[PDB]
Amino acid sequence: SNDDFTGEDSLMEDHLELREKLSEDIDMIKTSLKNNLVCSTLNDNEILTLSNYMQFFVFKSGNLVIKQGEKGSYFFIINSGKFDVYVNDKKVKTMGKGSSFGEAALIHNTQRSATIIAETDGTLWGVQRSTFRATLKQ
Numbered sequence: 001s002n003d004d005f006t007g008e009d010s011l012m013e014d015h016l017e018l019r020e021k022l023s024e025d026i027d028m029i030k031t032s033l034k035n036n037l038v039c040s041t042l043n044d045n046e047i048l049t050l051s052n053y054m055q056f057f058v059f060k061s062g063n064l065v066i067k068q069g070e071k072g073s074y075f076f077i078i079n080s081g082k083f084d085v086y087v088n089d090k091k092v093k094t095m096g097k098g099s100s101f102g103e104a105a106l107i108h109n110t111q112r113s114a115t116i117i118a119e120t121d122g123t124l125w126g127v128q129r130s131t132f133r134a135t136l137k138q
């Protein structure tokens, strides 16, 4: 019970903003999914399904998105802003709009392998693990 509201589902819920997707949002989600090295083999219907279940998440500078060693619950596409990747406390890259992340824990069914921080204010499209894994499990 002490652990019920710790974890990605609780954290991301706190960053959710209800939003109608605009044409440019749909377009960018589709191109970004064609660009993830796990989703590059998805067909257009699989992409459309993922896109339908994407939600909008808003972050301020220095907010944590993913923490290395935790259970993963989401796959993300960067919509705006800059997100840094840290592997064992060393920053390995900075990602911007169109990049995606969070697939590895979900595919391998393992802990998050890096920490991702909003370096600037930024926004993400995120889909829950259930939909993501189901789309790949075929």
Ligand SMILES: Nc1nc2c(ncn2[C@@H]2O[C@@H]3COP(=O)(O)O[C@H]3[C@H]2O)c(=O)[nH]1
Binding pocket: 066, 072, 085, 087, 092, 093, 100, 101, 102, 103, 104, 105, 106, 111, 112, 113, 114, 115, 116
């Ligand atoms: N481990 C690792 N993850 C990275 C790297 N660059 C981007 N990532 C992403 O950071 C994510 C952290 O959560 P996941 O392990 O689910 O998936 C990881 C990748 O999508 C990298 O160089 N190493």
